[PDB]
Symmetry: D3
Subunit: 337 residues, 6 copies
């Protein structure tokens, strides 16, 4: 409620500090009913320049079918017909020619809106992309990781916000790594923490397990080791584990049962031991928890690109576009430095 | 409401059994949270509690907390009890080829947890509730060593998520780190019969991070778990592998996977590993603004349940209510 | 000569079946090498080709290359074909529990490789030839997902080495990275039935770097494969483990391993792993002075063969000839079973 | 045909530049009929000074049976009776005493001509040895590896020549390593390349696989890594992989399908991913191909020693001794420096 | 004879320190075999024995078996000891991130084995002797959890075989199931310093079923173990892999493997796994006709030894004697 | 002391009940000093008809060097010169031709006394063999296992006797299996029990471990299940485990500490969990204990053949030949049945 309006306003503060320019967000699924309805609400709010990918004739005919006159302008680009199509094909080929992709396969991949979108963002023809409403997560994210890639020492990891009364929680990694090592969960925590700091909040990080400070072999030792590695890398942050999820979020359970712990006031960063636990958790909270859940957002990647969960609603997509715009604005300012 | 109806079936059971209440032994006779919860439960006439401990330490804790309604409850000191010596032999004979000599059987039986487990095993009590003061592994081991699992059963923790129109069942939330496909099928079968006890049709989802991919690893494992379970209960809707929102939301299922055999949303959610079950039910309980009760230990021959170390007083109240139902149900099975 | 005898058998099979020719669909409707090969094969009355692609882009490629003999040939664009929607639904139903949603079933079936395989699966074509423009895995995946293997079969590539008096059969040259002893025996059984189709007695060698050692690893594997194969076909000469020259040269066998059950040199060579099979047929084809034809995909329920990406035009001519033979045979099996 | 005369002429050039001395080549199989028949032609051509091992009494008696009058003067040595025999036992014993070989067992191994030949070569009593016409390769090569050993950072690897009309191809490793690592395949390539360079030919190296530049896990990744490691060690050489075999040899297939590749004009060095592929390939080419195949020759060992494949012909032994004399002359010119 | 010189060393040591006797805590205050042994050890002025238990229950056992020299030996009940709660806080602090909450530290500290080990850890005693009544793992676990291993040390049991003209040292007879080459080297180094304490030159054999084969498995492990050990003590004869008769018999070594660096026979025998060490010292003790003393726990921060469950009264006497030696030695090291 | 004299007298019983014939025992090490010295003592005792293998002159020459006139008549056989040599080659070749052994290698193996002795025993040309005084155990036992082989469901296992004053113990497997399964350990127990029964003693079997009735994973579980399997196969015997070695031998410790145990009166058959423990134990008892240890004897094989430990003394060999002669006579009576 409040959190999403506040992000929208920060987009505007960012934009009025850069000559009124809006980030350009490319959408591979120019024909998606859910994407188009979401774009209707966000064009009224001046959050981004949408670019739709597809056949101009298909896309315009879907726009009027759904009766949304506010999209009669939005840029529409057909990948094969774009002037840069050949340049993009050659650059994908050069990236993948020793990873089993011949030239003709590079052409057919670059004709796919998902690859064309990722290459547009990589080449500065757009500032970000939002994809994945119509296809599964692996299919949508592979072009991004193949084309944009991860920044140095970074790790691709999905991140979700749980919006509670007077507080948000950050959950990660909800989408990418099946079974991260201790070193990977430490890095996932570091990425999640800098996101929390961007919002003016102190990150307090819990490495989750089924155990409370046992350190037994398997995930308890892994999450205990992840906390130690992370604490070494950010000695200023509260980072703790291994601990159970209720121990983590509830400060009264922590202090009563584990008062030696370095984590006071409840964790707002929840790093998971495997993909089963992160993925089932955010989805169950979203369905039954009666709290808004936004994301997942792809962290660790060089440019702003987020893959929607296939189960997303229209309002989900709205929320994801807003934060993709913020991400796009922030990355463009680091690159100016 | 779901809890009030449970309290009522408990009363219905005893009125059909001469008014007797199940005897539930509590190893943690001095536990502040257990004692406060029992104040509420003797008021509701749910069970006959039996506290384990040194009687003067138990009575002085009751006196400290000012719970006059507990002044009559039975207190048993393990080492002093008449059955102690025979209990020591029963444990020794059970574990003598599992690294337990007679002297260590004696000191194990003096521990309230083992004495409670044996009281229940020998029919001296109808059920037990433990684990408010110790970690779950320490509490559940005497139970599994002493009472054991019924044939083809698997010990698995189960939780209820109480929503407005409906409850969800989550398992296995406590015992198996990484159940196989065969074990996940058996966990589902155990949870399904519990849902049936309350007059609800069980609809089972084998959870994963994937929607019907069947790729190697947990997607393949949970897909076969659904198949094995479908084999064993051809009358039930059992499906997987699927993501959790796919599982619970019938409109998401119908839109994206209409070939699925699962209609109307799942009310039985079987997990692929212990991290996911345990973290999920705990996050739901803390932030999900739904009541979560349990975990309850399924698959074991007599009624025994281990509280989560993080439980509240009312948590313990809720767990005792359903332990009483469990003890009553098992008690008539064995009369057969 | 071996190829001429195959062409005549196609005509022999074709006669006694109302003069009908098998219908062979080609996913790569604009491929220069495919169209050049079809010019030669239309003159020989080997098959009725079906080209997949946008009809105008196919006709423009045909007119550019100046191949007047193809102006009549059937051209089908997958998205536009009447059965496209029906084909999408059968692929969706086949793969909906293997990570494929409906929108993806639609985009797969619009790919000529998937559409051709489904055409063959549904009897709208009698066989298919693909893979001149894509790597082998990309070509064979739709075939295996759609058509599948017959019971107890294993998908395995097979190549013919045509020598002066003699042909050898090599397998598995394309599919299995590292087949088990059980899989290598089945590969032998599949290759043997192919050799028998041509009226030749199959004599099977299970290849290794070792001569009758049975030591752990592949020597033990290939010795056990021969045993499993001998059990399943007690009438065949099948032997291993042995080196390749021991296998082919009957004089080396007799001098050095006279106890062996393999006399007169092997004409079926089953390989222990994919590196050895794939490298061998390719080196023989480039540096030997013998024709190598194939690979042909064995073990699948309907006729589909994947050209090696490195093929020539004459290679494609040869593969279509034997694909036509395969399609005619499988079509007789399917009528027998109705 | 041509290639062998040129090698024979290079032996004579080497021998004319060093006072007419010929390398001394020990043959453990002193009564092998094939070895003796080949030796008839090898002394008429001044290729080597042969040393036959055996009971002098039947070696002369095998020679008189076959009626090869040109060999009655050639040296014949009986291992047990040799003056150096007992000193040889002590060096083998000291080498193997912590590898399960007692003194009496060193005595029996050293009485085996294969071990005696190897010790002769190692200690400078001969310049090279040729063995293995009558025993399998592992049995024949074991004494060589235990006694002579590999030079520093070397790997024992068998190598074969395929003699084509304008050029030869070299295949390796055709005999020793079951499943070489990426690092081992790089070293095998370097050894093969210096052999090609000895003949004044530019080596062009293909790391073979069933894949064309895929780098997928398993051997495609291994052969891609071997090419990378080898290029690091020889930045001046064309070395490429992973690739299929026809891709490797045929320069037109390479240029058409993989024009980014650093390997132009066809590979003349073919390094295999495992012993099944190398061993089966050279033998199938030799039997059904119509090109002569010579070898295998043992590379990577400190001193000149080659194992004949048990399947060898009489001409094979001749070819194989010639190249052993060349290697022996080469090492002998290295050591004079 | 060897034991008499050890006893005389015990007196020699404390006489150089104002006559203290080391205080040795016995967790098994009612153990019959412990109590009879203490009768002999009180007469010999070896230590100050401290028995753990209910004092009247201990005194009642003492005069029942009519043991008369223990009427003035010290008796401590753990729960009643003044420092009990301070001991509780210290165990909690040591293990709070290894799965032990405050309440579980409390019941553990009431167990004599944990209380005894903590007494030694905090300097209220100089050593402890346990394990007569319980299996070795149960007794040694509190010791290792509480006292722990010194830097680069490895917990390893060691036994003496007393022959007519020499003793052999066997290790590791109790702790490590299957030590690595690195661990076997550290076991050899630890055994070497014990042999050096008695003024004999240690000569170490890394035992195997193989004679200098170096084949994969334990032959290679024991060959590499010798190499690592020789690296760390270049002055010592350390050799392997070799068979047991090859190791002890110098004429077999010289005749069959004269290249070996080990001459005059090995007096330190390091074993490749726990089956071989444990079966060997036990078989030698029963059927050989040589005295076997131990096992003694090496590698730990202060003096703690676990009796083998099969021990005799005389076994306990011998082990208490050397525990006194160990305690005196460690007590002078820490003074520095 | 007494036990060995009782074996000698039973040898005389067996021979008198069979026309005074002595078993024929082949000794591959015809020049072994310790073997020859042992045989002087054994020929006066009417234990066997020895057959020495080697060059006749080499043996006659060693016999006179050591001056034992009692051997001047003993049979000497030179394998390659023996009439049966060619048929024996043909038979070993037929046994091993699919295990990497060509015809010429069969010839050189059959010329080795160890293989020739094994084939003599196998073909009934001799009744037993004793080898291994001069070579390591694996080397001596390989020809026996390849040629004579194991009887049905048998397992080759070394067995030793520890002769205590009221009693003997049997230890196994002291030589062959590195790490037997539970099933192998049960079969080893069954083999050792029938040997104890041959001497009129009730076998009482302990499956040894470092644990007392824990059944924990690893060795405790293996030996507990080994006991269970063996009890199933011989329901008439006391067989128990897992237990420690002193628990096993001492009936008072067992009765005091594990009174539930099925093993009363102490174990006289000690089955070991791995080769480290068996081999180290019998060697330590033999050296530092004060009791006689005889063997090891090879159990589980179809015909009588035993390998001396390389460390044996002259008495050792005498003791081993005595029990080999008993074994040969027993097997010879079974074979006539
Ligand atoms: Cl997905
Ligand atoms: Cl817990
Ligand atoms: Cl390919
Ligand atoms: Cl070979
Ligand atoms: Cl123990
Ligand atoms: Cl040995």
């Amino acid at each position: 409620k409040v959190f999403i309006r506040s992000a929208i306003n920060r987009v505007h503060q960012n934009s009025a500090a850069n000559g009124g320019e809006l980030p350009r967000i490319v959408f591979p699924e120019g024909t998606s009913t859910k994407v188009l309805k979401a774009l209707a609400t966000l064009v009224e709010e001046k959050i981004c320049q949408p670019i739709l990918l597809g056949y101009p004739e298909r896309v315009k005919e879907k726009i009027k079918a759904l009766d949304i006159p506010l999209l009669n302008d939005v840029s529409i680009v057909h990948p094969s017909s774009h002037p840069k199509y050949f340049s993009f094909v050659e650059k994908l080929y050069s990236l993948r020619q020793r990873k089993g992709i011949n030239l003709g396969r590079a052409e057919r991949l670059m004709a796919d809106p998902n690859y064309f979108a990722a290459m547009m963002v990589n080449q500065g023809e757009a500032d970000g992309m939002v994809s994945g409403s119509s296809i599964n997560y692996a299919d949508a994210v592979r072009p991004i990781l193949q084309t944009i890639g991860v920044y140095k020492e970074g790790i691709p990891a999905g991140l979700n916000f749980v919006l509670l009364e007077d507080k948000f929680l950050v959950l990660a990694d909800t989408t990418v790594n099946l079974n991260p090592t201790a070193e990977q969960c430490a890095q996932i925590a570091l990425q999640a923490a800098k996101i929390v700091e961007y919002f003016g909040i102190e990150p307090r990080v819990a490495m989750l397990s089924y155990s409370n400070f046992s350190g037994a072999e398997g995930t308890p030792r892994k999450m205990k080791k992840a906390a130690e590695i992370a604490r070494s890398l950010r000695p200023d942050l509260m980072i703790e584990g291994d601990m159970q999820a209720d121990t983590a979020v509830n400060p009264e359970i922590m202090e009563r049962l584990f008062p030696f712990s370095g984590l006071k006031g409840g964790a707002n960063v929840l790093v998971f031991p495997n993909l089963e636990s992160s993925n089932i958790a955010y989805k169950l909270i979203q369905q039954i928890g009666k709290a808004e859940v936004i994301g997942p957002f792809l962290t660790g990647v060089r440019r702003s690109a987020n893959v929607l969960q296939r189960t997303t609603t229209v309002d989900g997509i709205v929320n994801s576009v807003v934060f993709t715009a913020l991400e796009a604005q922030y990355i463009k300012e680091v690159l100016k430095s």
